[PDB]
């Protein structure tokens, strides 16, 4: 059995429930990744409850922690950096500094950026300096950029007419530097109302993944965090682009099926773990 | 399949490597526990490297976080509280306040205290107010108290002549309130030099567990954290005292075997995970 990959995950932490690192870390470890969790905040619970308690790490604590890891000579063992929601451009910059430092120590390290500008329940909830930093700075250094449709539309300053337009939008982002664009959640006029769709676009290839949309009274939080981390993990474990894409789609569906069957608002990560590791159902990606 | 237990784990976090919550959380989730990780610190790496970076949570942030969970109405779902190393008596008190609040919301909740006063590599490294708080306050409310021999000897103000004396020492701690005393690491005159031994003592019963001591150039950190969390998890999953005890012994040995076979200083938790969930070898406890 080959060496276990190492991944530095720089996101929110919640004590109860699942969001950010609390949505991603356990699933990635479960499928064979040594995760280094750098928690950018510690809250009681995620913000979508409309109430929470906790303090946010000042952004300088991010490169300080990485400096500590450099101090024990371990930074070269890091195979990837993963980021998600950012509370400020200052936090974003601290993350990019850490990405550059890790790439210095290991030139093969990957950076995956999950740009978060809001959620479908509300709209854009991020300051212009955050959305501007994501496009102008993070996208310029990210190996993999993983927007939802909201961020895709903002990045491109374009609203799609069709699935074709979403494909061209993702393609147009490649000119910025990333080797692939994962659109983790599609929304375009004429998309079937009962379907959850994803796109993966590289210069090489374009893939469309379709699965049934599950009904919930309240949209569970951290699905994007889960998808991003699993996708990156699969790539570190040697999957090609299409197989990482299909695994992610299949594993996220298992979590959601378990979450739904339990009547839970929080993702049933522990209960569904065997089906994260080995999903029963595999939805095939279609080439565009 | 029965409901997944919930456990609040209130300990240190390290970004790289394994100690405190970073030694315990993943293994407990892996065997079927929903863990609520409340990180009392976030350091770059554990302190036994002799260098590290990070800030410590002020102790008032502990009941504040739990207050947040109460605010979303979830505190009653907590089945256990787990603590380990304490940086101050003030931190200890905040943990006990949280234990009392949880026991109010769920009278069946268990508190397991892993009292940490040092490690065998050095000696006692904790202030008298910490070691005094552990005995006088934590032991008075803990359902399960899990000392190493160092803490057993300090608590009893007694040095053992034999294994028999260690048994009587553990027994004498029951008068303080705990339903069982797990001595996670035994050391007494005449113990075989190549053996790792544990005791579990309840009013009911006394068990001795023996396994081979593995050779390492540097003692791996977090073995006690791993053992405490697995033990408690097994009890939440319905094991009796002897079976929780034997599972813990077996699962910790698998991690150590993988850690040793890799030539690693840090615990190989991810690599060994299938053998945490289902240990190959089971060492039988012997009744005393
Ligand atoms: Mg997200
Ligand atoms: Mg310990």
């Amino acid at each position: 059995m080959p060496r276990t990959p190492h991944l530095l995950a720089i996101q929110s932490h919640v004590v109860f429930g699942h969001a950010g690192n609390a949505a991603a870390v356990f699933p990635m470890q479960r499928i064979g990744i040594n995760v280094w969790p750098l928690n950018t905040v510690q809250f009681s619970n995620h913000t979508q409850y409309g109430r929470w308690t906790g303090q946010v790490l000042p952004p300088e604590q991010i490169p300080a922690l990485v400096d500590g890891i450099a101090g024990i000579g371990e930074l070269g063992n890091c195979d990837a950096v993963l980021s998600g929601y950012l509370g400020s451009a200052a936090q974003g910059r601290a993350i990019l500094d850490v990405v550059a430092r890790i790439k210095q120590a290991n030139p093969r390290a990957l950076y995956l950026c999950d740009p978060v500008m809001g959620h479908p329940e509300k709209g854009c909830i991020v300051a212009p300096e955050v959305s501007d930093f994501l496009l102008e700075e993070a996208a310029a250094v990210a190996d993999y950029l993983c927007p939802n449709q909201l961020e895709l539309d903002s990045f491109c300053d374009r609203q799609p007419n069709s699935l074709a337009d979403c494909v061209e939008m993702a393609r147009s982002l490649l000119a910025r530097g990333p080797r692939a664009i994962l659109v983790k959640h599609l929304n375009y006029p004429g998309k079937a109302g009962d379907t959850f769709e994803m796109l993966l676009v590289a210069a090489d290839q374009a893939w469309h993944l379709q699965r049934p949309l599950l009904a919930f009274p309240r949209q569970p939080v951290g699905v994007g965090d889960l998808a991003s981390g699993l996708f990156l993990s699969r790539l570190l474990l040697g999957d090609d682009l299409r197989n990482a894409f299909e695994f992610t789609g299949a594993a996220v569906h298992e979590v959601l099926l378990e979450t739904q069957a339990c009547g839970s608002y929080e993702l049933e990560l522990v209960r569904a773990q065997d089906r994260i590791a080995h999903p029963r159902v595999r939805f095939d990606a279609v080439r565009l």
Side-chain angles (χ1 to χ4, degrees), chain A residues 190-212:
Chain A
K191 186 185 72 70
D194 57 5
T195 302
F196 193 101
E197 290 170 18
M198 304 200 284
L199 272 182
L200 185 58
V201 176
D204 224 330
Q205 57 191 279
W207 301 98
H208 181 53
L209 186 48
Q210 181 179 305
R211 55 175 175 77

Side-chain angles (χ1 to χ4, degrees), chain A residues 163-187:
Chain A
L163 172 67
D165 287 0
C166 300
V167 182
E168 292 301 310
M169 287 158 77
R171 212 163 270 168
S172 72
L173 259 33
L174 293 170
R176 280 169 201 273
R179 62 189 88 178
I181 314 298
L182 169 60
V183 190
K184 328 182 295 299
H185 176 263
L186 285 167
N187 188 38

Side-chain angles (χ1 to χ4, degrees), chain A residues 107-120 122-181:
Chain A
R108 284 192 276 94
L110 306 168
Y111 173 41
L112 152 3
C113 170
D114 171 10
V116 184
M117 286 171 62
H119 26 84
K122 289 166 195 76
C124 180
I125 64 160
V126 119
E129 32 268 84
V130 172
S131 56
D132 286 334
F133 164 90
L134 259 359
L135 187 54
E136 301 169 355
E137 289 159 76
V141 294
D143 294 280
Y144 298 97
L145 186 59
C146 308
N148 290 332
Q149 187 78 45
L150 176 74
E151 295 83 13
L152 217 220
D153 292 5
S154 308
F155 283 166
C156 299
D157 196 9
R158 154 136 86 141
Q159 137 96 37
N161 292 307
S162 64
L163 172 67
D165 287 0
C166 300
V167 182
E168 292 301 310
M169 287 158 77
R171 212 163 270 168
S172 72
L173 259 33
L174 293 170
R176 280 169 201 273
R179 62 189 88 178
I181 314 298

Side-chain angles (χ1 to χ4, degrees), chain A residues 238-250:
Chain A
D239 275 18
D240 67 23
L241 248 21
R242 181 200 183 155
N243 286 270
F245 188 47
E246 293 171 340
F247 184 95
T248 302

Side-chain angles (χ1 to χ4, degrees), chain A residues 264-281:
Chain A
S264 305
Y265 179 40
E266 295 284 352
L267 265 18
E268 293 280 355
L269 257 31
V270 172
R271 275 187 85 84
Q273 67 181 96
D274 295 358
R275 279 142 175 185
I276 298 174
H278 301 279
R280 282 171 306 165
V281 273

